[PDB]
């Protein structure tokens, strides 16, 4: 209830003019008071439209100002161009910055003037420094200046922060004011005509530096930020890679005193085990060389901070390092050229000096692993393999973005990347031919996409036709299903919605064991992902072909085989300016349904093969192996205690044993710690990487101005929990400026806290971080009922595409390829279902969401709507609340810290109740209705749709499920069986969980199965209305948790809920009209 004041102050500061007037608009759920709000509105519009003073009416309608609820504030201020500079001149009295062209290796990667690299605009491209975000540099500068101005009179520790950040913004703005501000167009791009006479890499550097200096709360933060901002102005290729590299060695220096374990995918069972740190000497020499490079780059304070820690090597001073490890990834992306980014991968050293004893075993192990995956379904003749064509054709929506191709749906032209749409086009024109897999050769090389991530190399992405997906789909789904229960596939061991994300190293760490962990992300152009890898799979397919008797299955397997034949020789379109290069690359990368699990297989075979060579010199028992994409780790135990010399010799043997297969590696062996892309451990304590740029993005998405603010808030919350903390008021300023909308040149609207923080398709953030807010009031209920009426909108593009002839042909072909003779009873159902997977195409979503925002805006302008009784969540909570009673409690501390970097209140909760131990289905995947969909398809259907579908009669359930690819007999059996009644409750569980972010954010980290939380939640049991007692216990838990988060202290509860209200609510249960935005979720693991 504080945000709107900051909004008002932002408006007053940014505009400042006599002509700048400020126009609130209010609402109340009570008619008479609402008409007085309407009156105030009216009179304000008039007064605005007559240059009359507004300050007089504000007393007359005092009641509305005190008790009614605000919506938004309008603003009439003219163009008044270039006022940002006219304000900014004062904060730029420092010295500007000079580039240094002889730092980056390349020529165009220096921060020199555009004209020195692109004299003509016809060869200009802003894509090497495009922020790719619908928010301006000017927005950032205005926000910083507003923060600095309002915090210009404080006298505390805050002032010690303020002087520091003021100096940082001085350093930045001197450099900016030296030349000027680039001006955004309507699309938030930056054209040639502003950058023609200015440095090319000023924008990303500026934004990244603003984000960093806005995340300063301490002295070391100031040192680090000043030491990166001033060097990131020139160095743009060897900086985040530099400071983020030693961490991998540092984790091998922290003694464990106390540990965490994993059992099943979120279980913990702590251990007081102590483990020393047997680090060799030569890795210190390596580390010393790395610090010499660090100092050689122009870094002074942060080596000293890295140097004074080694005197003790303690874990209490260690979070600084972790903090440092996150300060490296908030400098921006290294958006270099497609060519030079491919050549990070396309350097090959293929040699007729590798072993042959190794590759044959490698090939065989891949073959054997494949056979273990596929023995059962290939043999028992599963339906999903026979009809693999139809399976992939349904599951196209869960695929990659194919190359743009010109379509026509009746009377339009489309350049879609979605392969389902490609299929729709090719069926009509006789071009659909899935059995004949295209070659990939000189006559038709392959396109590319670029998988980027800062501080590392650029990975490549295949962008293929739609036959490759269809071939790989069914076989890869059975392989993944097999890997759900296999432990060693770290990407895929789960229980249908989880990953082993807290690792499985710490079981067998001891004084006798060691662990070798290894980054394997560069192993795409390598000689072990070419020929042997493919041929092992070919061999497995031969065996599997002899392991079935049906012909459809053998054909499907032969098509998958033929796909691997074509992938063994594969060329690659790569432009460079005007001319086009094509390079032989017959190997593996991402952009495929198969790449992930198959790379995991190949790394597993590789490490199993290598690890049987250390056996020539050591006796050990392989206890555990894990492989997940861009990393892999294996633990191993000895007959004795570990020494430095065994570590050194093992490392040399591992390095040379990879060299025997012609494979480069920075081999890393340790005893207590690991480092990988997504996480790392020191001293039996899990830390995480907070490297998600907020004000700069990887590539250019498709979301609106609105939703990118929500994405940024989720990333903000995440990074805060990780450790990287930014000052929240700046973020709120960005959110309001990104939700601000221009109705004319001078009219602009700004919504309020009570529109943006309400559970709908328009939620963006919360008034108090780590806490969703609900509505006990009339007013939040009122607007939630209003916004649900408006969330449902239309897309004319989708309506006209579904009315053409080709779509109709596609629906007909789906039917007669699946079932026939109900052409007007189910086929229409299948069209309505195909509509559910046209929405992946982005412009449809933009049409629909822009329509939602405009419909929202035409009642943000004018007064409010009653919305006609449509029941939602706050209606229920309104009725649950008046039979509560709170009382002060006092819980003790009995749970262990294992995420130090958290804010102290969340940690206090974790340090008093447990951390989560299960993961209950956000999708309802284990639900008996969903185990059909995961059997005949991959398709999601959103929990809104399922929660709705179950509310209907037993007739249209059959239509809706058969329309999702499922056959008719099992649907009829499901309805006759009466299993939906055994699944109303699970679906509603998942629904309510999706509505309230229970599996999305901070609430993913908390134990609701605790005995300590439960004894506070004293709601007696009634029985035979399970939903009510369920929601009551859940909501009471949420009350206690929100009180804990927002105030630190604890409370109890009690609800002697009357049976009358139990029954009144039981009927309100399965008629809920509520919804939560996809863009608002904050997955802690990305």
């Amino acid at each position: 209830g504080k945000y709107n004041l900051i909004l008002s102050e932002y408006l007053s500061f940014i505009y400042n003019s006599q002509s700048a007037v400020q126009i609130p608009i209010y609402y109340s759920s009570n008619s008479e008071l609402e008409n007085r709000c309407i009156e105030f509105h009216s009179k304000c519009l008039e007064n605005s439209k007559n240059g009359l003073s507004l300050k007089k009416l504000f007393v007359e309608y005092s009641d509305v100002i005190e008790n009614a609820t605000l919506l938004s504030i309008l603003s009439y201020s003219y163009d008044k161009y270039n006022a940002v500079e006219r304000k900014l001149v004062k904060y730029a009295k420092g010295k500007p910055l000079e580039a240094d062209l002889t730092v980056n290796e390349l020529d165009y990667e220096n921060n020199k003037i555009t004209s020195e690299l692109f004299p003509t605009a016809e060869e200009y491209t802003d894509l090497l420094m495009d922020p790719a975000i619908l928010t301006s540099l000017s927005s950032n500068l205005n926000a910083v200046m507003f923060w600095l101005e309002k915090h210009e009179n404080d006298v505390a520790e805050k002032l010690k922060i303020y002087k520091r950040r003021l100096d940082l913004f001085t350093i930045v703005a001197s450099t900016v004011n030296k030349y000027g501000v680039p001006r955004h167009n309507a699309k938030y791009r930056y054209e040639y005509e502003v950058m023609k006479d200015k440095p090319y890499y000023l924008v990303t550097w500026a934004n990244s530096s603003i984000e960093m200096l806005m995340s300063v709360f301490s002295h070391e933060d100031y040192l680090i930020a000043r030491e990166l901002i001033v060097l990131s102005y020139s160095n743009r290729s060897t900086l985040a890679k530099l400071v983020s590299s030693p961490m991998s060695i540092l984790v091998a220096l922290v003694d464990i005193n106390g540990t965490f374990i994993t059992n099943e995918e979120l279980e913990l069972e702590f251990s007081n085990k102590y483990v020393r740190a047997i680090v060799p000497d030569q890795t210190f020499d390596e580390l010393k060389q790395m610090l010499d490079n660090m100092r050689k780059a122009g870094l002074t304070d942060i080596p000293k901070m890295i140097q004074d820690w080694l005197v003790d090597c303690s874990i209490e001073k260690f979070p600084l390092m972790a903090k440092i490890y996150s300060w490296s990834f908030h400098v921006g992306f290294r958006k270099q050229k497609m060519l030079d980014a491919a050549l990070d991968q396309l350097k090959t050293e293929y040699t007729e000096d590798v072993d042959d004893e190794m590759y044959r075993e490698y090939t065989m192990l891949i073959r054997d692993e494949v056979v273990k995956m596929l023995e059962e379904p290939v043999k028992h003749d599963d339906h999903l393999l026979q009809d693999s064509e139809l399976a992939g054709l349904l599951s196209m929506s869960s695929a990659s973005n194919g190359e743009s191709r010109q379509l026509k749906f009746g009377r339009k032209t489309i350049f879609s990347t979605k392969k389902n749409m490609h299929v729709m086009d090719d069926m009509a024109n006789g071009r659909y031919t899935p059995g004949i897999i295209p070659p990939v050769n000189v006559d038709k090389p392959i396109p590319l996409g670029r998988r980027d991530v800062p501080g590392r190399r650029t990975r490549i992405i295949f962008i293929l036709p739609y036959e490759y997906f269809i071939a790989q789909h069914a076989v890869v789904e059975k392989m993944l299903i097999y890997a759900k229960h296999t432990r060693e596939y770290a990407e895929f061991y789960s229980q249908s919605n989880q990953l082993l994300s807290y690792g499985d190293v710490t079981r067998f760490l001891s004084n006798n064991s060691m662990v070798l962990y290894t980054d394997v992300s560069q192993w795409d152009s390598s000689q072990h992902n070419t020929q042997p890898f493919r041929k092992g799979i070919i061999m497995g397919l031969d065996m599997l072909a002899n392991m079935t008797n049906d012909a459809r299955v053998i054909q499907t397997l032969n098509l998958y085989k033929q796909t691997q034949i074509n992938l063994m020789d594969s060329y690659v379109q790569i432009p460079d300016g005007n001319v086009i290069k094509k390079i032989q690359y017959g190997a593996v990368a991402s952009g495929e349904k198969q790449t992930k699990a198959a790379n995991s297989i190949a790394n597993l075979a590789l490490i199993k093969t290598v690890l049987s060579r250390i056996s020539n010199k050591y006796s050990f028992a392989t206890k555990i192996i894990r492989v997940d994409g861009d990393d892999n780790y294996a633990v191993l135990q000895f007959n004795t205690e570990v020494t430095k010399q065994m570590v050194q010799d093992v490392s040399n043997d591992v390095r040379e044993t990879y060299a025997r297969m012609n494979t480069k590696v920075k081999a890393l062996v340790s005893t207590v710690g690991i480092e990988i892309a997504k996480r790392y451990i020191a001293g039996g304590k899990i830390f995480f990487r907070a490297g998600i740029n907020l004000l700069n993005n990887e590539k250019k998405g498709q979301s609106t101005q609105w939703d990118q603010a929500a994405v940024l808030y989720s990333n903000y919350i995440v990074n805060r929990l990780r450790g990287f903390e930014t000052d929240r008021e700046f973020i709120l300023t960005k959110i309001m400026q990104m939700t601000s909308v221009a109705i004319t040149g001078s009219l602009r609207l700004f919504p309020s806290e009570r529109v943006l923080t309400t559970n709908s398709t328009f939620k963006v953030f919360d008034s108090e971080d780590f806490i969703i807010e609900y509505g006990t009031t009339d007013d939040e209920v009122y607007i939630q009922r209003a916004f649900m009426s408006l969330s449902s909108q239309k897309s004319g593009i989708a309506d006209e595409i579904a009315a053409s002839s080709t779509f109709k042909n596609y629906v007909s072909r789906l039917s007669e390829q699946l079932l026939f003779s109900k052409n007007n009873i189910v086929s229409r159902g299948i069209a309505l279902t195909e509509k559910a997977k046209l929405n992946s195409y982005a412009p449809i979503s933009l049409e629909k969401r822009r329509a939602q925002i405009s419909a929202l805006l035409t009642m943000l302008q004018k007064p409010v709507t009653f919305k006609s009784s449509k029941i939602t969540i706050n209606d229920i909570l309104r009725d649950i609340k008046p039979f509560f009673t709170v009382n002060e409690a006092h819980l003790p501390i009995q749970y262990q810290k294992f995420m130090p970097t958290l804010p102290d209140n969340v940690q206090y909760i974790i340090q008093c109740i447990g951390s989560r131990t299960y993961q209950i289905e956000d999708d309802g995947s284990k639900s008996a209705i969903s185990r059909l969909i995961s059997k005949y398809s991959v398709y999601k259907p959103s929990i809104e749709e399922l929660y709705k579908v179950i509310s209907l009669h037993e007739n249209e359930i059959q239509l809706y499920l058969i329309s999702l690819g499922i056959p008719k007999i099992d649907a009829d059996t499901y309805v006759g069986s009466k299993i939906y009644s055994q699944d109303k409750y699970r679906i509603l569980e998942s629904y309510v969980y999706n509505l309230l972010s229970i599996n999305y954010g901070c609430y993913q980290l908390f134990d609701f199965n605790s005995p300590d939380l439960e004894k506070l939640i004293r709601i007696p049991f009634k029985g035979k209305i399970p939903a009510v007692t369920f929601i009551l216990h859940l909501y009471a838990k949420l009350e206690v948790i929100n009180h804990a988060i927002k105030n630190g202290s604890w409370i109890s509860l009690f609800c002697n809920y009357p049976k009358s209200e139990m029954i009144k609510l039981w009927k309100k249960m399965w008629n809920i009209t509520s919804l939560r935005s996809p863009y608002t979720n904050a997955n802690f693991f990305q």
Partner: peptide
């Protein structure tokens, strides 16, 4: 520079001494 670096190398030998190694070294 290098005085503190060499002292880090030396003091990161005295610290974290393994016992079996000094036994085999006395033996060797």
């Amino acid at each position: 520079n290098k005085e503190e670096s060499k002292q880090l190398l030396e003091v990161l030998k005295t610290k974290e001494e393994h016992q079996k190694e000094v036994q085999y070294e006395i033996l060797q």
